[PDB]
Amino acid sequence: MDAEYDLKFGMNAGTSSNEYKAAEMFAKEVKEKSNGKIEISLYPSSQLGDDRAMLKQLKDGALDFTFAESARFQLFYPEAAVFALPYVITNYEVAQKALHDTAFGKDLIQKMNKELGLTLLSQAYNGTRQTTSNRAINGIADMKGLKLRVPNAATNLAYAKYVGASPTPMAFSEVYLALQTNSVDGQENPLATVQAQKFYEVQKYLAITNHILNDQLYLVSSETFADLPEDLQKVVKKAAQKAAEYHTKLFVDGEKELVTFFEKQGVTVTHPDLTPFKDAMKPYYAEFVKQTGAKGEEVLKQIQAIN
Numbered sequence: 383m384d385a386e387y388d389l390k391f392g393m394n395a396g397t398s399s400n401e402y403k404a405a406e407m408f409a410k411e412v413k414e415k416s417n418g419k420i421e422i423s424l425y426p427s428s429q430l431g432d433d434r435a436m437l438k439q440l441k442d443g444a445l446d447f448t449f450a451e452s453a454r455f456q457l458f459y460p461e462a463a464v465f466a467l468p469y470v471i472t473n474y475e476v477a478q479k480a481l482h483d484t485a486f487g488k489d490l491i492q493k494m495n496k497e498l499g500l501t502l503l504s505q506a507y508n509g510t511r512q513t514t515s516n517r518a519i520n521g522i523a524d525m526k527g528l529k530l531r532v533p534n535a536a537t538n539l540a541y542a543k544y545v546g547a548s549p550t551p552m553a554f555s556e557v558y559l560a561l562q563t564n565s566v567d568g569q570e571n572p573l574a575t576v577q578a579q580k581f582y583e584v585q586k587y588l589a590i591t592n593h594i595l596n597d598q599l600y601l602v603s604s605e606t607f608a609d610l611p612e613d614l615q616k617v618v619k620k621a622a623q624k625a626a627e628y629h630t631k632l633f634v635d636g637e638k639e640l641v642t643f644f645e646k647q648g649v650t651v652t653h654p655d656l657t658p659f660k661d662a663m664k665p666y667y668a669e670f671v672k673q674t675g676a677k678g679e680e681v682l683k684q685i686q687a688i689n
């Protein structure tokens with residue numbers, strides 16, 4: 383009657399987040415549908431490290447499940463930065479097809495398993511990133527000199543650089559206190575994350591910059607997964623796909639309602655003209671291609687071929 387597999391799921395997201403809620407549904411489904419044989423415990427709030435660290439732990443066996451964006455694999459395969467080049471992926475359906483229907487995406491999935499020890503269970507939408515700050519962003523000119531926190535990720539650094547801001551990389555866990563103490567001026571994250579982390583308590587302004595679309599991959603250690611029998615492998619996979627659908631809904635539904643939530647909290651929302659933002663990224667696309675060469679040019683081609 384005790385569990386036969388005691389598995390662990392680590393995440394940066396906190397206990398108020400859509401990601402945690404969907405992870406909870408995943409653990410419930412797996413426990414139910416395995417008839418008790420699998421129990422998944424959750425380790426949120428970066429208590430095990432950030433997402434780079436948890437990825438390594440899945441490879442080493444010490445952690446069984448985690449989340450990652452397609453774009454995070456730019457750390458290992460630099461052309462994979464295409465997923466997060468600002469304004470390139472314009473909606474979630476493209477993000478699905480970029481990963482699953484392109485030669486490059488399909489090859490990335492195989493390398494994740496053979497080289498990184500990761501098996502992909504499902505993909506979700508994790509929102510489109512927006513920009514909060516302690517002063518109004520009425521146009522790109524207001525970004526100049528803004529001390530903008532970004533995650534430890536080259537594409538986020540590059541958004542900040544190319545719009546004129548002063549980037550400050552730092553881990554997710556440290557942002558609330560950095561905004562509270564105004565050691566940084568702003569940050570950038572999907573709207574649902576601004577809510578979950580209560581960044582609206584320490585940011586008076588929100589700008590709809592739509593600059594980077596985030597997905598979320600449900601990952602399992604390939605070692606852990608291969609040790610499960612085939613019928614429990616199917617359980618885990620079906621549970622991951624159900625959870626991912628719920629995960630996407632949480633974020634889609636929130637993007638219809640969260641701007642007015644923040645206005646009720648007294649945040650001032652702006653909708654700057656995005657053509658100068660998009661223009662400001664054209665040099666960055668040029669530099670991506672210079673750095674990644676033939677490979678980067680081909681992934682950009684495969685992604686443009688998606689309607």
Ligand SMILES: CC(=O)N[C@H]1[C@H]([C@H](O)[C@H](O)CO)O[C@](O)(C(=O)O)C[C@@H]1O
Nearest residue numbers: 394395433449450451454533535554571
């Ligand atoms: C799966 C995951 O860990 N996502 C985290 C991402 C990625 O680390 C980053 O976008 C680079 O891929 O950054 C955050 O948005 C952030 O620190 O602001 C928190 C979010 O939980």
